[PDB]
């Protein structure tokens, strides 16, 4: 139905963002 | 390699959600044509008493 | 005259509220288990017991 959002982020926190974003939504995400 | 297989399942979920839109609409158009059986019920119910009282 | 009336009230209301928090903990345990684990039909249910000084 829905579920697409596009953005940009720096590479100095890209590994720290995907580690924290998984614990906040309790999974149920696909971040490539 | 997983985003292509994920979007095809939601595209399969779109027609299943539209099949309910093709099932709720199918029971509604059938109801407006099965309501004519009430017209055929009262027409035979009135003619039995519009001749015994005539 | 209000001692026996209140002690009979606190004996049944606190037991209802402690069972209400126990039911809300299982609702918090039924939640966050279908998101942390997969939801084919239902996740495997399990619990634990208390422990002292070896946590």
């Amino acid at each position: 139905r829905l579920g697409f959002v596009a953005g940009v982020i720096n590479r100095e926190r890209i590994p720290t963002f995907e580690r924290m974003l998984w614990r906040v939504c309790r999974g149920n995400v696909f971040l490539r | 390699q997983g985003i292509q297989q994920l979007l095809q399942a939601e595209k399969r979920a779109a027609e299943k959600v539209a099949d309910a839109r093709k099932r709720k609409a199918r029971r509604l158009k059938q109801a407006k044509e099965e309501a004519q059986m009430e017209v055929d019920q009262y027409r035979r119910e009135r003619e039995q008493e519009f001749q015994s009282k005539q | 005259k209000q001692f026996g009336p209140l002690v009979r009230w606190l004996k049944v209301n606190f037991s209802e509220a402690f069972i209400a928090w126990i039911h809300v903990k299982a609702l918090r345990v039924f939640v966050e288990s279908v998101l942390r684990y997969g939801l084919p039909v239902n996740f495997q249910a399990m619990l634990l017991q208390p422990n002292k000084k070896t946590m």
Binding site: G27, N28, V29, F30 | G2, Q5, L6, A9, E10, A13, K16, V17, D19, A20, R21, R23, K24, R27, L28, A31, K32, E34, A35, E38, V39, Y42, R43, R46, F50 | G38, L39, P40
Partner: protein, 52 residues
């Protein structure tokens, strides 16, 4: 590996809501199919009851 596990959870979560949102339309097609039949039959009798 572990990212393929989250893809399998999304396939079970999207098909579950696709089964819930379609069955809720069927439950709306179960209550309103008789509520429109009972309303139209009471309406059709009144157009003949004045003629009766």
């Amino acid at each position: 590996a572990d990212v393929q596990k989250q893809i399998k959870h999304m396939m079970a979560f999207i098909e579950q809501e696709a089964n819930e949102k379609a069955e809720e339309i069927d439950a709306k097609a179960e209550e309103e199919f008789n509520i429109e039949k009972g309303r139209l039959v009471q309406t059709q009798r009144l157009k003949i009851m004045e003629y009766y």
